[PDB]
Every structure is written in structure tokens, then in C-alpha cells.
Design a protein around this motif. Structure first.
Motif, short mmCIF file in Angstrom:
data_model
loop_
_atom_site.label_atom_id
_atom_site.label_comp_id
_atom_site.label_asym_id
_atom_site.label_seq_id
_atom_site.Cartn_x
_atom_site.Cartn_y
_atom_site.Cartn_z
N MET A 1 0.79 -1.20 0.00
CA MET A 1 0.00 0.00 0.00
C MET A 1 0.83 1.27 0.00
SD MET A 1 -1.24 2.47 2.40
CE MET A 1 -2.20 2.11 4.08
N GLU B 1 -7.07 2.48 -2.91
CA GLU B 1 -8.14 2.99 -2.08
C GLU B 1 -9.10 3.95 -2.80
OE1 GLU B 1 -8.34 2.96 1.77
OE2 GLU B 1 -7.33 1.02 1.66
N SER C 1 -7.74 1.88 4.65
CA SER C 1 -6.55 2.60 5.07
C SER C 1 -6.86 4.08 5.18
CB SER C 1 -5.41 2.39 4.07
OG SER C 1 -4.82 1.13 4.24
N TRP D 1 -5.82 6.30 8.33
CA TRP D 1 -5.18 7.57 8.07
C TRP D 1 -5.86 8.73 8.72
CZ3 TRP D 1 -2.48 8.80 2.99
CH2 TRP D 1 -1.52 7.81 2.78
N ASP E 1 2.77 0.43 10.69
CA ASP E 1 3.42 0.81 9.45
C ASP E 1 2.66 1.94 8.75
OD1 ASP E 1 4.34 -2.21 9.90
OD2 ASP E 1 5.85 -1.15 8.71
N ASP E 2 1.45 2.19 9.20
CA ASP E 2 0.70 3.28 8.63
C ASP E 2 1.13 4.50 9.42
OD1 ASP E 2 -0.18 0.65 8.76
OD2 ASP E 2 -2.30 1.11 8.54
N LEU F 1 4.24 5.50 7.69
CA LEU F 1 4.01 6.19 6.43
C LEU F 1 3.82 7.67 6.68
CD1 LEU F 1 3.11 6.64 3.42
CD2 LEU F 1 1.18 5.14 3.92
N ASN G 1 4.72 9.50 9.27
CA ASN G 1 5.72 10.08 10.16
C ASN G 1 5.20 10.47 11.56
OD1 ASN G 1 8.53 10.30 8.68
ND2 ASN G 1 7.04 10.99 7.17
N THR H 1 5.17 8.61 14.61
CA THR H 1 5.57 7.93 15.85
C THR H 1 5.83 8.93 16.96
OG1 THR H 1 8.01 7.69 15.66
CG2 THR H 1 6.68 6.17 14.45
N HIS I 1 14.89 2.80 19.84
CA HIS I 1 15.44 3.91 19.08
C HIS I 1 15.13 5.29 19.68
CE1 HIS I 1 12.19 5.87 16.72
NE2 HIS I 1 11.58 4.70 16.78
N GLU J 1 12.73 4.46 10.15
CA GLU J 1 12.23 5.86 10.07
C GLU J 1 13.05 6.87 9.20
OE1 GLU J 1 10.50 7.55 14.22
OE2 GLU J 1 10.50 5.40 13.75
#
Lengths: 247, 245, 245, 247
Positions: free
Chosen positions: A174, A210, B4, B8, B54-55, B58, B60, B62, B93, C127
Motif C-alpha cells: 500500500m 483505495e 486505510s 489515516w 506501518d501506517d 508512512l 511520520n 511515531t 530507538h 524511520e
């Protein structure tokens, strides 16, 4: 962090209580369903789990073989039912593809049971020396079976897989097709990868599709097949056929 | 079952929750604290990080997620008045980042009334002298340090050696299948004894039944966590279940 | 053949060298720059990092090693007067460190006369938004950015996407066995074309013979490195071999 | 970064040009040589290389099988020569241990050729589901062969290896025994790990032994065997026997 107990999970794995769900793949041009990705599920007492949740338990219960066998046998029956009109993929971990002992059984089971070998796709997941894997695949390809690889370029050493295995279909995840309105470099990258696949004589499936704006871009960059929420989440075969009377 | 797009939109809106899993004293059988665990509240569902991490990658996000967890846990520790501890999971990290830890350190100094009641749980476990420096600076405030999934993955004994670890956490499989696993029982006691010899304590996660409790109690495990007590819950539900809270 | 004691003593004494491997323009056949490569000078031998990297790990000496390489390469770039570039290998974890890059950035600003002649080679590749910020701040000084071993390991296309990469380097095996590997030739050209479409250039490492050169030259590879030109050498020996230097 | 060309390397690998070197292991008490670790080398035109240098090439040349075979056959001959007086270990990657096809050949080759099965040690390196590996090992153990594992606690999931494989000897690498004058926690850790191994009924080898102060500490913490520069670097068998007339 579990909404359900590990116990309930482990007993479902012992019951070999799996379901195979299916996510349509659509031709980019004709927008027709051309086949499905088979996606294993674990049905427990209170819910249905996806592989990302129950993986740890399967390994610890050394149930990986049961699960693969389930996935392959269920898929073969399903392909046989659809009269050769649709392809169905199964996910086989790189470890399993590189096992001659497994791949010999699979070749044998396929030759004996699958009436439409051209409608099966082995999708290599969880991606070392590649020559044994190459040979394992080539033998199953001798029957008419197709070979794809997941996670292209995210996963390990995607270029080496591409170079040294007999890949027919490259699948992208994706992230590969996200942010494209504001990503010229990724637009260039996608186009480079699609034309490379075509120049290798393969085809590309982009997963995680999507929205229609993505469809417009990917169609124009010559992506062959689409998969993602925009068409359909993964579903029981039952609910596919209720949604798409074509199938 | 969800888009997704849906994930998001949630992350973009910083739509997070912090659930709590109780930790129970093996001696007293009383709840003594909680593992804080983050969740994404999407328009129609609630997800654990793995179903969206992992989304998070994508987008940024975290760092935004890391602030939410620290801020929320500290507010709840304060609200509980020093009666319970709460841990927060911090990736190795981030633990290694002199930038992030100084930020966190000054944050705790400023906002946390009860620093002995915060625990940094190091997750996703490479280099260590800087991580050890970072960790000691905050422990000087009173904060405790743990590490999860001991036994699993890379360099468990190395982290234990090199970092000021107060608490070792094991996963569900470390304590699985013990009715026939003599070797694992030997291993468990050895590790519990090791932790104790290093001045620390042990939390076994994944506790599913009384049989496990009997064995682990005999092995001198200090704390339990698992579905057998409670799965993760929002604090309002924690409070319904546990009037002592 | 040597003790760990011997390796320890060397590292403790910061006993490092920087060797140089020439990079040659595929068009002109002239040396245009050098890959800087660190070595440990022990009392009796000279080692490449891999033969001691984990001993570097033990002794917490990566930062000391990282300063040596930057300092040394900058002094040599200066001494060569802007006529040659020199790259330094920086681990991705240092590239991600806002702390280390600002330090490096101010260092280059202060000491490097010819910033367009420095190249940061990102090695040991997780990252990225912060790494991209760090990298752009120094590229604003004029410094160039490359990545090695493209094709090998995790997320090559992801780094390429996300970071301001000027130069992609491939390893010896990317260009190995091409006399019968039609597929790899297809792949190589595709990647060279990709890099070119992204405004960048390509260095193929591991160039071992003229046959390779003929093919890679036809594929429009921009630069070569390999034993076929020169293995890594100290600059004094580089200068003996190459009077143009 | 190579002092020699890749070409010269690749031609040596094609010549199957390997050497097996040996590093003594010494009893902690009696300070007597009890056996050796076999360590493969590649002899090229201009030098002799250690596995850390030439690994990449072997995989890319798919020569891993040749090399293992070399290591096992050379070791078996060497054990046979020493009249059963010394054990010799061979490094076998976890992948290979988990391959029934390989481990069946090895079992067969061992049964046919090795006169002193009790003097061979399979040392598991490059450390998933463990049940197949467990079975593979158990079959070779049925012949008298010993099993060790390297890199304890540095490598992947050392505790799970210990739990679910039939390990006889735990080996620790150099970092594990470094800095001990100023490391109380590591002194406690070592002692915990040694007593655990003994309570599992195994023994411990500490590699990377460099000095007498280390020997003093490790002897007192009940380590069974030593390996490292303090006794001997790895050497051709020829140079071992010239150094130690015992052998």
C-alpha cells in the motif's frame, strides 16, 4: 495486548480451525475481476483473526505446516469449482519455497488435484541462496502454475528475488502507491518498476488501492492489476459471490 | 474490514487511546499497577498498533504517538495519586535518542507528581552507552525502567548487562506449555534468580490460568499480567471492575 | 592471527587510517574522486572494520571512529584543492541523529573549504523524515549524498524515495555474471535509467574487468570503482600511482 | 574494500579451495586440550581468507553446499586420524540444521564414515519453528554426536534454542567475558548462565579467552572449557601438532 485470551487462540489452531478469505484482483483496463488473493483467517470461538495477530502462536505450536496445507488444499478446491475462470493465489513463505521437501509435496498435490494449474499463483512472502528456491519454483511452473512476490522493494532484497527467481507477477504494497499527488519521485519510481516488470515479461499488481485518483495514475503508468478497498476488502467466497454475481 | 483511509484519518486526527492492563503482585494478589498500551480510535473501530504501526510509519507519526502516550499516562498516574504505577512502551530507538529523552525527562520533571510511579518499558529491541546515559538521567527523577519480551529476539542479556534495568518482562510463550517442559521451568527459575541477583524483579506476561500461577508463584516471579486477571481495558472500565482503583 | 588485546589497544589509541578507492568517470576514464574507507592500524596489522566492528561496538568507539573519518577526509579534500571528491561512510543511525548531523554540519561549515567535494555515503541501511531533514541541512552547504549497495537489503527504493539521494552505489554482485544474465542486464539499465530520471547518477562498485566496463558503459553507468582500476590505497600510494593526483 | 580482487576469490571458491583450521578447546581444570573447533578457511592465490570475508561470494556463487560438505568430510577424516582422543566441531548454519534433506545426508555420511561419532560436535551457527531442527539433531545425536550452539545470548533467541533444541554445549563469544574486573552485573550473569547450563546437564565453552585474569574468574564460575588467543589462535592441524606434541 489482546482483546481475546491466548488460550482461545491456541485451541482454534489445534482444531485446525482456518478459513480462506479472498480479495479480488481487477484488470486495470477492463476493470473486470481476473482472480483473487487467498488470505488465511483463523476462526476462534468469539471472532475471526488475520495472520498478523495469530502468527506467533502458530510457530510456537509448530502449526505452520497444517496452515499451509489448509491454504493450498482449500485454494485448489476453490479454483476447481470456478471452472478455470479465475486465478487464486496462496501465500507461501520464502522458507517453504526453498524447501525441496515441501515443494515436492506441493508439486505432487498440485499435479494430482488441481484441474486448472494455470489458475494457481504461488505468492512468495516473508522474504539467501536462491538456486534451490529457483529449482523448486521451476518444477511447479512446469505444470502451468504462476509465481508472484509480495512487498516489492519494502521486503528483503526484492531486486535479487526478481533477478534470480522465475517471477511472473510483482506485487506492491500500500505504501508504494500512497501520497502520489505530492510525490513526483514516487511517480517516477513506479513507472520505472512497472516498465522493468514488463521488460522482464511479467505483470504488476498494486495492492492497497483505495481511491479513483490512484486508479487514474496507475492505469496511466501501465499497472496491469489492482487490489484494495476501492474494489473489495477480503471476504468469504460466499460474500464475494453475493457481491459479484459474475463469480 | 476497514479502509486505510479510515486509519489515516484517525492518525491524522491523533485519535489515540491508552488502555491499561493490570499487573498483580504474586504475593498479595492485589493490583499494583498497569501496562499502558496505545490504541487507534478510527471512525468505526479500535486497533492495536500492529494493525496500523506501518501506517504510523508512512505518516511520520511515531513522535506524535509517543507524546500522546507519555502525556496521557502521566495524567493518569497523577490522578491515581501515587497508588498505582503505569508503564509506557518506548522503542529502543527513542530510548537511544538524546534529543527525545531529554525532552521526556524535562516533561516528567515538570508534570509528573509521582515519578516513582512511571515506568519506561523498552520495546522493539545495536548501540548502548548513550541509551544507558539517557535512562539514568530520568531514573534520577525516580522513574523505573523495564524491558519486555525477555528471551525473545536480539541481545536480551546484553540489554540487561548494559542498561539500568529494574524489571524484566517475559512474553506469553516463555510461560507456555510448562506441564511437560522441564527445561523451560529450569530456565524460568534461572532467569528469575538472575533478575533477583541483579537487584530487580520479574513480570511474566500472558498468564492464562491458575496452573501457571501456581508454578510461577513457586518460581518466585514477582508480578503477573494476563487475560487470567484482565485483558487490556480503558480506565473507566478498569475502575468498574476494580473498586480498589 | 592477532589478539583481541591487539585490536583493543589500537582502537583505544584511536589508531585509524583512511584509505581511498578511486572513482573513475565512465566517459573520460579519468579519476574523479575517492571512496574513503576506514582501517585500524594495530601494532602488527591493518584491519577493515568488519574484522573489528563489533570490537568497536564493545568499546563504545563508533563516535570516535566517525570523527576520525570526517576530520581526515575533510583535511584531504582541502589539500586536494577542490580537484577531487571524497566520500565518507556514515551509518544510517548517525544520519538519523539530529545531534550528530548538526555537529557534522557545523564542522563542515567551519573546516571544509570545498563542500561540493564532500560526499556522505549512507551505509548500514526504519524511520526517515528526520534523516531527510538532517541530510538537506548539510546539502545546503553543497555536500552530496549517496547510498551504497543499492539492491541489497531493506528498502532501497524507500530510501531513494524519501531521502535527497544524489548518487546510488551498487555492489560487486549487482554487476556479477552478466555474460549470461539477461535479466540482470535489464535490471541494471532500468535502475540506471531510474537514477537518471531522478536527477542523479550511478557508481557501480566491484568492477573487475574490461568486459564489465564495456557493458556498464553501454548501460550509461556514470562512474566505476573496483579492483580493475585500483583497490583501496593510502593517499601516498594513490599519489605514486596517479600523477594527476 | 578489498586488498584482493573479487575475481581471485571467486576462482578459489570454484576450485573448492578450502582449508579446515582448528582452534584448541582446553579443560578449565586440568588445562588439557580436549578437542578443537573446526574453522573453514579459503586459500586463494595470494592469501588465506576467513569466512567473514568470503561469505558473500559463496552465497552468490551458491557454493554453500560444497563448503559444508568440505567441512564435514575433512573433519570426519581428522577425527578418525586422532584415534578418538579429541573432539572436533563443525559449524552448521541453523538453515542447514533445519533441513531434513541436508541432515539426512549428514546422518548417512556420519554413520558410514565417522569411526568415533562421540568425537564430533555440530555447532549451530547463524541462528523460527524449531521442531524439525529438533528432530534433525535428535537423529544425529542417536549416533553419539554432540550438539553445541554459538553466540549465546548475542545471537537470535538464544533462550529458545536452549529450550527447544537438544543442546549439549553452550558457547559464548568474546564480549561475554570482556570487562570483568569492572563488571559485577556481567559476573553475576555469567554465573547464572553457567549454572543454568549445568542444571540443564550441559557444559559451557567460553571463547575469546585472552588472559590469565579471565581464566581465574571463569574457572571460579565453573566454566567447563576455554578457547581463545591465550591458548592458541586457529591453526592448520600441522602447526597444532608442532605446537602440542600431545596431539
Amino acid at each position: 495486548a489482546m482483546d481475546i485470551s491466548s488460550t482461545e487462540i491456541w485451541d482454534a489452531i489445534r482444531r485446525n480451525s482456518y478459513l480462506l478469505y479472498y480479495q479480488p484482483k481487477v484488470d486495470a483496463k477492463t476493470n473486470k475481476i481476473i482472480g483473487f488473493e487467498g488470505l488465511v483467517r483463523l476462526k476462534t470461538a468469539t471472532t475471526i483473526l488475520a495472520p498478523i495477530d495469530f502468527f506467533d502462536d502458530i510457530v510456537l505450536l509448530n502449526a505452520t505446516r497444517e496452515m499451509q496445507d489448509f491454504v493450498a488444499e482449500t485454494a485448489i478446491k476453490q479454483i476447481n469449482q470456478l471452472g478455470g475462470r479465475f486465478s487464486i493465489s496462496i501465500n507461501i513463505p520464502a522458507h517453504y519455497v526453498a524447501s525441496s521437501t515441501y515443494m515436492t509435496f506441493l508439486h505432487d498435490y498440485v499435479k494430482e488435484h488441481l484441474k486448472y494449474p494455470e489458475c494457481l499463483e504461488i505468492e512468495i512472502i516473508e522474504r539467501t541462496e536462491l538456486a534451490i528456491a529457483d529449482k523448486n519454483l521451476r518444477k511447479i511452473k512446469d505444470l502451468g502454475v504462476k509465481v508472484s512476490m509480495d512487498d516489492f522493494g519494502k521486503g528483503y532484497s526484492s531486486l535479487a528475488y526478481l533477478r534470480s527467481l522465475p517471477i511472473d507477477i510483482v506485487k506492491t504494497d500500500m505504501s508504494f502507491i500512497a501520497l502520489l499527488k505530492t510525490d513526483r519521485k514516487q511517480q517516477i519510481i513506479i513507472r520505472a518498476i512497472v516498465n522493468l516488470c514488463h521488460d522482464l515479461g511479467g505483470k504488476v499488481v498494486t495492492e492497497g488501492v483505495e481511491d479513483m485518483e490512484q486508479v487514474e495514475k496507475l492505469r496511466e503508468m501501465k499497472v496491469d492489476y489492482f487490489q484494495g478497498y476501492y474494489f473489495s476488502r477480503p471476504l468469504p467466497m460466499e460474500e464475494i459471490k453475493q457481491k459479484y454475481s459474475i463469480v
